[PDB]
Ligand binder design. Structure first.
Ligand SMILES: O=P([O-])(O)O[C@H]1O[C@H](COP(=O)(O)O)[C@@H](O)[C@H](O)[C@H]1O
Ligand SMILES: [Cl-]
Ligand SMILES: [Mg+2]
Ligand SMILES: [Mg+2]
Ligand SMILES: [Mg+2]
Ligand SMILES: [Mg+2]
Ligand code: NA
Ligand code: NA
Ligand code: NA
Lengths: 242, 242
């Protein structure tokens, strides 16, 4: 029946960290004549626009930056949630208060600023501070491997906030993310489920346990496909839809 | 003897929140044929470039972004300074640690992110977090006026650290600044007081207490002139230098 293809962006439609190629851009627009298409990424709208184009909300039937915490359908923004409204101010403050006190007790070479970055769909927590310089970021990343600073911090937060409906995830070099359970890429499915699609396909390059496509891939609402590269994505689409 | 004119940038060489005009820029290059000129501002070099032109270091004999913590003379970097280098990483971290722990204990209706904004010349500290919305800023300031949150916080910091040569200044609705003693616009006077000037003129538009030109205006090493607008600065320069 009527169906939808949901694509991870980075590593799936694009080489890691790159803009999409015009060839792949043309392929997806031809695919879209047979089936609706949508993209989902953890990065913010501006990054999605850089990777896929400023006119992204016109070229894709759905656009889900920030895992869908910002969501466009048919070019218009859908209803929105944020972490503080979902969790309540009291839990937000307890989480922040705890993280602030914990960071105060970490011994580091350097500390700077923006220890807590408050985003739509998460708190990003950095022991050094997100305002650090590139040199300081690498110094921290290197010490963190040696001392397990972020790993211990997250293990402590998981016990302290057991039962409160939070997920913690270390990514990148200086930080970890604290977000409501289920606000990974599965969040966007709320905007497409039970909306007439007989099948919702999903394509992603990090569907393994621990990868950022694992939960949406394994969700029963999607017919999930693991891709190894954008050329593998195109291969599967030509098989299924041509 | 030989003299130097030092100008505030915003509101003195430019209309507030506006770029320098071509006509003013021409005026200063003519004035520079008669007397050395310099600019000092609170903003970083990139912002000074936005206000005065990317070639700013070529158009003035001295350029002092960040109150002189960055100093250019005759087109080349004379000196760079920042709070972490001056205070040392140990003291930086003790200050930040104390503020993080303290903020973790403040009871507020809301907390957000960027409790500590690290700048080259100061730490900007906010119990609620600088990322909060304008509505949240107003709510906080109402509570602060009745609970004296920022006053008690600064009082306790003054007891604990000010012997380390630190100043604390409350301002606006949600934050206070922590900075080494004398790191206001006066800081830049160290870079010109050795170059043989008999008079250092200073022109600024916020020369009253509280304003960011007040300390440099009042410093005995400057011949200070308060100006209401760029046109007023120009009228005064006409009478002084023809
Ligand atoms: O590098 P950071 O700490 O600024 O972290 C940045 O990138 C990470 C992912 O990076 P990757 O996919 O390469 O693991 C994200 O988890 C994080 O939210 C973001 O702020
Ligand atoms: Cl912070
Ligand atoms: Mg990917
Ligand atoms: Mg599935
Ligand atoms: Mg001014
Ligand atoms: Mg004076
Ligand atoms: Na961005
Ligand atoms: Na869980
Ligand atoms: Na000196």
């Amino acid at each position: 029946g009527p169906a939808l293809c949901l694509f991870d962006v980075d590593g799936t439609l694009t080489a890691p960290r790159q803009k999409i190629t015009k060839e792949m851009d043309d392929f997806l627009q031809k695919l879209r004549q047979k089936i609706k298409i949508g993209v989902v990424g953890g990065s913010d709208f501006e990054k999605v626009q850089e990777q896929l184009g400023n006119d992204v909300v016109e070229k894709y039937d759905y656009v889900f930056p920030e895992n869908g915490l910002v969501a466009y359908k048919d070019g218009k923004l859908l209803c929105r949630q944020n972490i503080q409204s979902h969790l309540g101010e009291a839990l937000i403050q307890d989480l922040i208060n705890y993280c602030l006190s914990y960071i105060a007790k970490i011994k580091l070479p350097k500390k700077r600023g923006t220890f807590i970055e408050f985003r739509n769909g998460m708190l990003n927590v950095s022991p050094i501070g997100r305002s650090c310089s590139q040199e300081e970021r690498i110094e921290f990343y290197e010490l963190d491997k040696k001392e397990n600073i972020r790993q211990k911090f997250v293990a402590d937060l998981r016990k302290e906030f057991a039962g409160k409906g939070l997920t913690f995830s270390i990514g990148g070099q200086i930080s970890f993310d604290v977000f409501p359970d289920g606000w990974d890429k599965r969040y966007c499915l709320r905007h497409v489920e039970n909306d007439g699609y007989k099948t919702i396909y999903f394509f992603g390059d990090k569907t393994m346990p621990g990868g950022n496509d694992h939960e949406i891939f394994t969700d029963p609402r999607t017919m999930g496909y693991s891709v190894t590269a954008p050329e593998d994505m195109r291969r599967i689409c030509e098989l299924l839809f041509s």
